[PDB]
């Protein structure tokens, strides 16, 4: 018959317990500033859906971000604004300073408070044992946080962890693909970049949740520690399941299949063959070992597993033996 449901192992009812216009986004009415409030300085990047500049805020000369949107669906920039403004404050979560409109061509960008344009995927690749753990901590804020309050990112990746190493600060960035978790809500597929789109995206299981994030941040934690970019390096959307076949097992994936009654594209068939899992040792070499511990291989098995009921949350992440050394410190600082 159907795909078998599934709900949030936690944080299920969050948006449920709330006010509609917490998570009603479609219904928000956005009051438009005045672009011209901001003068901008230089391009710091682009992506699909925005140009994004460094600027000025006349009125007090303060360092902004801005986010000049490319043409969309009105609904979408709904969307991002009202997570923005549902997190802002939260730990590790970028903060939106204003909501603006060019007064000629009507084109809505967003403000941010400013950080450094560089991003994690610029020194995740040279950073210390510590330092992994430390950032790797850091970004579990975030998403404990965003998941406590009903929303689920669903584009973690390096190039969305701003980082200014400097004063060891991260901010979670990007929140134009994120979601609201409602239990029993279909969700698109067609989220987050190859390298790290979880199973459920690549075999069209739509009832997912927060547990998406958390597989999307293995894929960073094997990327950094094995110093492997990416790790799962799928071609295509339909060679990325076979690259993680090929690591986690295909015994796993079938069993998961099997499990949430999942049809698999026919394509899949002929592809993914037959795999063991694989230990981890099998990733770990001279210019690795540093980073490489028990530890680490423990909490990283614990991310990446086919079932998204499976994972760890990002509490019970933040609790796992790999992070001691950085609660440690925190509580010592
Ligand atoms: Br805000 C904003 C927007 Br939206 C556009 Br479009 C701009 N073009 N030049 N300068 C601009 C600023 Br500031
Ligand atoms: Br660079 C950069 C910065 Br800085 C911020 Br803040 C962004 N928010 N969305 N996309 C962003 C990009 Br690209
Ligand atoms: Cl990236
Ligand atoms: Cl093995
Ligand atoms: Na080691």
Redesign the pocket.
């Not at 500033?33 to 901008?40: C, E, R, S, T, V």
């Not at 000629?104 to 960008?109: E, G, I, K, L, M």
């Given at each position: 018959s159907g795909p078998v449901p599934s709900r949030a192992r936690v944080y299920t009812d969050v948006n449920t317990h709330r006010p509609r216009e917490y998570w009603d986004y479609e219904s928000h009415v956005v009051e438009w500033?005045?672009?011209?409030?901001?003068?901008?300085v230089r391009k710091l990047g682009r992506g699909k859906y925005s140009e994004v500049?460094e600027?000025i805020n006349i009125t007090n000369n303060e360092k902004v971000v801005?986010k000049?949107?490319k043409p969309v669906k009105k609904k979408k920039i709904k969307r991002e604004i009202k997570i923005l403004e549902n997190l802002r404050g939260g730990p590790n979560i970028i903060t939106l300073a204003d909501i603006?409109?060019?007064p000629?061509?009507?084109?809505?960008?967003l403000?941010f408070e400013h950080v450094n344009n560089t991003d994690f995927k610029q020194l995740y690749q040279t950073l210390t044992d510590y330092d992994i753990r430390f950032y790797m901590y850091e970004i579990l804020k975030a998403l404990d946080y965003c998941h406590s309050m009903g929303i689920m990112h669903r584009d973690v990746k390096p190039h969305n962890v701003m980082i200014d190493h400097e004063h060891r600060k991260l901010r979670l960035i990007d929140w134009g693909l994120a979601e609201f978790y409602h239990p029993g809500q279909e969700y698109n597929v067609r989220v987050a970049s190859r390298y790290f789109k979880g199973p459920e995206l690549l075999v069209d299981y739509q009832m997912y949740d927060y547990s998406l994030d958390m597989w999307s941040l293995g894929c960073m934690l094997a990327s950094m520690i094995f110093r492997k970019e990416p790790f799962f390096h799928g071609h295509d959307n339909y060679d990325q399941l076979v690259r993680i076949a090929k690591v986690l097992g295909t015994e796993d994936l079938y069993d998961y299949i099997d499990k949430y009654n999942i049809e698999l594209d026919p394509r899949f068939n002929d592809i993914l063959g037959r795999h063991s899992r694989k230990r981890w040792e099998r990733f770990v070499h001279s210019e690795n070992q540093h980073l490489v511990s028990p530890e680490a291989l423990d909490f990283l098995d614990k991310l990446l597993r086919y079932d998204h009921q499976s994972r760890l949350t990002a509490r019970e992440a933040m609790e796992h033996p790999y992070f001691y050394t950085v609660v440690k410190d925190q509580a010592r600082m």
């Open positions: 500033g005045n672009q011209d409030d901001y003068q901008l500049f600027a801005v000049i949107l603006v409109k060019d000629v061509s009507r084109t809505p960008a403000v």
